[PDB]
Amino acid sequence: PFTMLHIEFITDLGAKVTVDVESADKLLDVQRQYGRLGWTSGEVPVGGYQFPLENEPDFDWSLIGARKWTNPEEMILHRGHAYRRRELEPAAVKYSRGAKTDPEEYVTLAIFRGGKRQERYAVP
Amino acid sequence: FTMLHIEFITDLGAKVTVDVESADKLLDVQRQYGRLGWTSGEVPVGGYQFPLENEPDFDWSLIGARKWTNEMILHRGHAYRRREPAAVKYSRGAKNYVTLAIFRGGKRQERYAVP
Amino acid sequence: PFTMLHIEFITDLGAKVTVDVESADKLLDVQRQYGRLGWTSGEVPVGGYQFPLENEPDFDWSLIGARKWTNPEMILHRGHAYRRRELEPAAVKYSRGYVTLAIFRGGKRQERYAVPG
Amino acid sequence: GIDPFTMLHIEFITDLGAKVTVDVESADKLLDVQRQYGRLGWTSGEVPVGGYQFPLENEPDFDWSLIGARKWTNPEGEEMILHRGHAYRRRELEAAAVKYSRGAKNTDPEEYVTLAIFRGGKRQERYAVP
Amino acid sequence: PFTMLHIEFITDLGAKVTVDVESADKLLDVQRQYGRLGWTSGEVPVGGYQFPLENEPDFDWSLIGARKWTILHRGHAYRRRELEAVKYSRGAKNTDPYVTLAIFRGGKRQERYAVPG
């Protein structure tokens, strides 16, 4: 009746678009839907997002407006940027790129370490 | 008709605004999404300032925090330790000391407590 | 029909809350209402607010989320305390340890700024 | 291409520095709302670096309430433009332009700062006083 | 009682105006409409927008509030340059923290980015 949510995006054209959501349990569906187009919401936290380690092999990258993509090398595309996969030995997996256009030798998109697995982060 | 609206940053960093029916329900909605790790607004320079008598039973979900023993306070993938007019401080020290909350002075406020 | 206004506050808990208003002539009522709770809207302008001189003795401090408070007479605004100062045009200022909250000088009196009565 | 049935919303900063957003029925009523609250001294958005840019043929009868300003003659006898507790003086520029600006101070990070420049362009009637 | 979209613009008078949109498939029409008036949405990404290379000869500049002028964007003028990719950039300025607008390079050509018809 008035139990509505609103999510604010930045689009592929850089436009500032807010999308209405019917209720709380439909929020993630909306996030994947517009993330599939390359739209993002909010800023990347300093040092990149932090996710559980057991969520790495099947993480839905559309939750943050990213997609997998292969070169003449398997990469992750996020805002006309490409991130490479790294292994750290607790175990961890980082996704980074070279700095510089350099708002303060590497800047990370996401780090997978520790924590307990969360199902909602996985590809349905 | 007329409502209220509160703006959050979620666990996925998303910018989500939540509708509220009326003023007497703002805190209920704050505790609710605070329990999920959602925050609203910025931490004031020098940390929040609460009355001294509100320390032993402060509802940390009001600011998106949770107690966690390894006894620490988790607020955004950050951990704060307890430290001791008298006063109590919750702090750390990184590179991006920085305090989350200070309890000192003031008269008590029952709305700040765990229901 | 299409006559709503929306005012954005920062609460006592630092939360970011926007309040709906029925129409323009009910805006000040909403400002005093949430102002008494300590909620503020917007930023304090550099050099403090500027009000007419004849509005000093009876200014509604709730219009900016402030309140009178005497310790063993101050103005409380966000866990900060401002002291009263005089100057001799004749101007009254509220200062603390210098950063100012409000300066009262010149101008013609404005009725809506006074405590209702 | 204007849609008759979709609402708009405009965000102001008031005389008390409060953040207030105003609802508008449709696109064709936006200007009416801008003049109304502009006459009270409310502003929307920031002054673009180097000041606003308007067509030259709009200077003699520009509605200053469109940006929350007003004309004001002062004790010394000079005609000024008031915008947010600031006063701007009228200057002319011969090759042709017209400039409204004031001296810069300490509490102002970039010596002059300008409010509006009238130069070139073709006339637009919506900028004029009704 | 339905679910819409909302797009936030900065106008020709610098005002902050948000426009309602009926549904997702009508967003583009709204963008072209107010873009034709010089309204923009969001900020120009550092290093400028990035498009597919095959979208250059018939790009609808109204999608970002620009217009052809034998490119005008925000009272600024940008010149065409070739790379051997196509670059649109202007000189420096004493009022900005070469600065490029759009860069066409690689990628697969996209439907909607073209002037309709």
Give the DSSP letter string of E44-107: PPTT-EEE-GGGSTTB-GGGGT-B----BSSS-B-EEEE---EEEEE---TT---EEEEEE-SS
3-class SS letters over chain A = CCCCEEEEEECCCCCEEEEEECCHHHHHHHHHHHHCCCCECCCCCCCCEEECHHHCCCECHHHHCCEEEECCCEEEECCCCEEEEEEECCCEEEEEECCCCCCCCCEEEEEEECCCCCHHHECC
Number of Cα atoms under 13 Å in the Cβ half of residue D92 = 4
C17 interfacial to chain B (CB closer than 8 Å):
yes
Residues of chain D neighbouring E13 (CB-CB closer than 8 A): 34, 45, 52, 66-67
Name the minimum distance, in Å, from the CA of C90 to any CA of chain D.
Answer: 18
Name the minimum distance, in Å, from the CA of D11 to any CA of chain E.
Answer: 6
CA distance E101 to D35: 34
Locate the chain D residue with the closest alpha carbon to C16: D19
Residues of chain E neighbouring A5 (CB-CB closer than 8 A): none
CA distance E94 to B114: 55
A37 interfacial to chain E (CB closer than 8 Å):
no
Residues 6+ apart with CB under 8 A from A54: A115, A116, A117
Residues 6+ apart with CB under 8 A from D95: none
- What length does chain A have? 124
Residues of chain D neighbouring C41 (CB-CB closer than 8 A): 16-20
**In Å, what is the CA distance from B60 to each residue of B66, B73, B113, C78?**
6, 8, 9, 21
Closest by Cβ to B12, choosing from A5, A6, A64: A64
Residues C16, B6: C-beta atoms closer than 8 Å: yes
A7 interfacial to chain B (CB closer than 8 Å):
yes
Strand locations in chain C (E): 5-10, 16-21, 49-51, 67-69, 74-76, 81-87, 91-96, 99-104
Residues D17, C47: C-beta atoms closer than 8 Å: no
Chains D and A touching, counted as 3 or more CB pairs less than 8 Å apart? no
Name the DSSP class of B84: -
D45 interfacial to chain E (CB closer than 8 Å):
yes
Residues of chain B neighbouring A45 (CB-CB closer than 8 A): 13, 76-77
Please report, in angstroms and rounded to a whole number, the separation of the first and last CA atoms in chain B: 30
Query: In this structure, which amino acid lies at residue C104?
Result: F
Locate the chain C residue with the closest alpha carbon to B104: C79
- What are the φ and ψ backbone dihedral angles of E52, each rounded to 5 degrees? -70, 150
B42 interfacial to chain A (CB closer than 8 Å):
no
Residues B13, A43: C-beta atoms closer than 8 Å: yes
CA distance D65 to D57: 18
Q: Which two tokens stand for residue B114?
A: 């765990």
Pairing assessment for the beta strands B48-50 and B98-103 based on DSSP bridges:
parallel
Burial C41-52 (b: 16+ CB within 10 A, else e): bbebbeebbebe
Nearest to E21 by CA among D27, A28, B6, A30: D27
B3 interfacial to chain A (CB closer than 8 Å):
yes
Resolution (angstroms) stands at 2.8
C63 interfacial to chain D (CB closer than 8 Å):
yes
Strand D87-93's sheet: what is its strand order? D52-54, D112-119, D97-103, D87-93, D79-82, D70-73
H helices within C4-110, ranges in order? 27-35
Nearest to B40 by CA among B68, B67, B18, B12: B18
**In Å, what is the CA distance from A77 to each residue of A82, B100, C15?**
5, 35, 34
A100 interfacial to chain E (CB closer than 8 Å):
no
A87, exposed or middle or buried, with CB in 10 Å at 0-12, 13-18, 19+? Answer: exposed
A75 interfacial to chain E (CB closer than 8 Å):
no
**In Å, what is the CA distance from B25 to each residue of A6, B19, B39, B62?**
19, 11, 17, 13
Report whether C13 contacts D30 (CB < 8 A).
no
Q: Tell me which H or E stretch contains D126.
A: none
- What are the φ and ψ backbone dihedral angles of D31, each rounded to 5 degrees? -60, -40
Cα torsion angle, E27, E33, E36, E39, sign: negative
Residues E16, D49: C-beta atoms closer than 8 Å: no
Closest by Cβ to A41, choosing from B15, B18, B19: B15
CA distance C28 to D14: 12
Longest CA–CA span in chain D (Å) reads 51
Residues B41, C15: C-beta atoms closer than 8 Å: yes
CA distance D67 to D69: 6
- What length does chain B have? 115
Residues with their C more than 2.5 Å from the N of the next written residue in chain B, i.e. before a break, are: 70, 84, 96
Q: Tell me which H or E stretch contains B5.
A: strand B4-9
Report whether B100 contacts B73 (CB < 8 A).
yes
Closest by Cβ to E14, choosing from D1, D30, D46: D46
Residues 6+ apart with CB under 8 A from D26: D2, D3, D4, D5, D6, D7, D8
Q: Count of H helices and E strands in chain D?
A: 1, 8
Torsion of CA E57, E60, E62, E66, to 10 degrees: -10
Residues of chain D neighbouring C43 (CB-CB closer than 8 A): 17
Closest by Cβ to C79, choosing from B40, B49, B63: B49
Please report, in angstroms and rounded to a whole number, the separation of the first and last CA atoms in chain E: 35
Number of Cα atoms under 13 Å in the Cβ half of residue D117 = 15
E23 interfacial to chain D (CB closer than 8 Å):
no
Cα torsion angle, C33, C34, C37, C41, sign: negative
Residues 6+ apart with CB under 8 A from E47: A101, E100, E103
B24 interfacial to chain C (CB closer than 8 Å):
no
A102 interfacial to chain E (CB closer than 8 Å):
no
Closest by Cβ to D45, choosing from E15, E18, E19: E15
* Interface A-B: count of C-beta contacts within 8 A: 46
E21 interfacial to chain D (CB closer than 8 Å):
yes
**In Å, what is the CA distance from E90 to each residue of B24, B28, D75, E101?**
55, 53, 46, 8
Locate the chain E residue with the closest alpha carbon to A19: E5
CA angle A38-A41-A42, nearest 5°? 135
Residues A41, B17: C-beta atoms closer than 8 Å: no
CA distance A121 to A104: 29
Method used experimentally: X-ray
Q: Which two tokens stand for residue C67?
A: 């309140």
Q: Which two tokens stand for residue C3?
A: 């006559």
B45 interfacial to chain A (CB closer than 8 Å):
no
Name the DSSP class of C50: E
Residues of chain A neighbouring B17 (CB-CB closer than 8 A): 5-6, 8
A77 interfacial to chain B (CB closer than 8 Å):
no
Residues D19, C41: C-beta atoms closer than 8 Å: yes
Locate the chain D residue with the closest alpha carbon to E22: D6
Name the DSSP class of B35: T
Q: Tell me which H or E stretch contains D92.
A: strand D87-93
Number of Cα atoms under 13 Å in the Cβ half of residue C102 = 24
A41 interfacial to chain E (CB closer than 8 Å):
no
Place of tokens 């008494």: C36
